């Protein structure tokens, strides 16, 4: 029996924390070798020093999944790929299903206190300004569904947008957390360019 579910109700509203720009600080860090075979990927995680950026990378990968490989690999240490829909957490609104019910952000996290956290990941091959635009596009994509459902349980909407030299996010990230996202993105780009052949 979970006593945190017995609290007075929180304000039912949508919270969006402000987007911040983060720069990576990877510097001259070893990047693991990879071997691609017809795909399977063996990543030489033995080459990394204990605790350096990249410690979340697993040595073996299997890859219909090629188009989203860069996205899924970059954020794989934070969330596995999902098809969890708004409707699985909230049910339909106004007694009629619509397109918003079947949107699927990267994460929908429910807490005992009754808040819901919606998290969306995205990438860009451009610069930091491109990453900010990508983050704002994902806010635009999910803001209507999150606002409407905040009437049921309060929602906070979080975005992580990665580029080659940093992250735009409204999470409060450490240098090491920024570096892990960027490090994985850079490696995913290297692998993807060879996979596309």
User: CA of 50: how far to CAs of 53, 54, 150, in Å?
Assistant: 9, 9, 42
Q: Using the structure block, give the residue that is written with the tokens 């990047």.
A: 31
The residue with its CB nearest to Mn ion is 121
What x-and-dash track marks residues 31-60 binding Mn ion by CB under 5 A?
------------------------------
Cross-strand pairs, 117: 109, 156
Dihedral angle, C-alpha 172, 176, 181, 182, nearest 10 °: 110
Find the catalytic residue in 70, 138, 141, 153. Answer: 138
Q: How far is the CB of 129 from Mn ion (least distance, A)?
A: 19
Residue from 41, 53, 61, 106 that binds Mn ion (CB under 5 A)? 106
Size of the site for Mn ion (CB under 5 A): 2
In terms of CB distance, is 48 or 119 closer to Mn ion? Answer: 119
Query: To which H or E segment does residue 134 belong?
Result: helix 128-149
How far apart, in whole angstroms, are the C-alpha atoms of residue 132 and residue 165? 13
Select 119 or 187, whichever has its Cβ closest to Mn ion. 119
> Parallel, antiparallel, or unpaired: how do β-strands 60-62 and 20-23 relate?
unpaired
The smaller minimum CB distance to Mn ion, of residues 48 and 167, is found at 167
Q: Which residues contact 107 (CB under 8 A, 6 or more apart)?
A: 78, 79, 82, 117, 118, 119, 120
Query: Which range touches Mn ion (CB under 5 A), out of 6-14, 15-23, 117-125, 181-189?
Result: 117-125
69 interacts with Mn ion by CB under 5 A: no
For Mn ion, the binding residue among 121, 142, 158, 185 (CB under 5 A) is 121
Closer by beta carbon to Mn ion, 48 or else 108: 108
Based on the residue annotation, tell me whether 85 is a catalytic residue of this protein.
Answer: no
Buried b (16+ CB within 10 A) or exposed e, 140-167: eebeebbebbbeebbbbbbbbbbbbebb
Q: How far is the CB of 130 from Mn ion (least distance, A)?
A: 15
Query: Which residues does the annotation mark as catalytic?
Result: 138
User: What is the binding site for Mn ion (CB under 5 A)?
Assistant: 106, 121
């Amino acid at each position: 029996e979970r006593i945190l579910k017995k609290q007075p109700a929180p304000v039912r509203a949508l919270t969006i924390h402000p987007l911040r720009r983060y720069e990576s600080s990877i510097y001259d860090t070893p990047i693991p070798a990879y071997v691609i075979k017809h795909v399977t990927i063996d990543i030489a995680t033995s080459e990394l020093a204990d605790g350096q950026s990249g410690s979340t990378i697993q040595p073996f990968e299997s890859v219909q999944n090629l188009t989203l490989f860069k996205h899924d690999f970059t954020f794989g240490h934070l969330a596995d790929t999902t098809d969890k829909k708004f409707v699985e957490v909230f049910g339909v609104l106004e007694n009629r299903a619509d397109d918003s019910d079947f949107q699927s952000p990267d994460m929908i996290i429910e807490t005992e206190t009754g808040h819901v956290y919606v998290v969306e990941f995205t990438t860009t091959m451009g610069d930091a300004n491109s990453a900010d635009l990508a983050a704002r596009n994902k806010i635009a994509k999910y803001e209507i569904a999150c606002l409407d459902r905040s009437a049921i349980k309060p929602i906070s909407l979080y975005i992580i947008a990665v580029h080659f030299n940093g992250v735009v996010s409204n999470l409060d990230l450490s240098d090491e957390e920024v570096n892990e996202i960027v490090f994985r993105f850079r490696l995913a780009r290297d692998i993807f360019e060879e996979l596309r052949e």
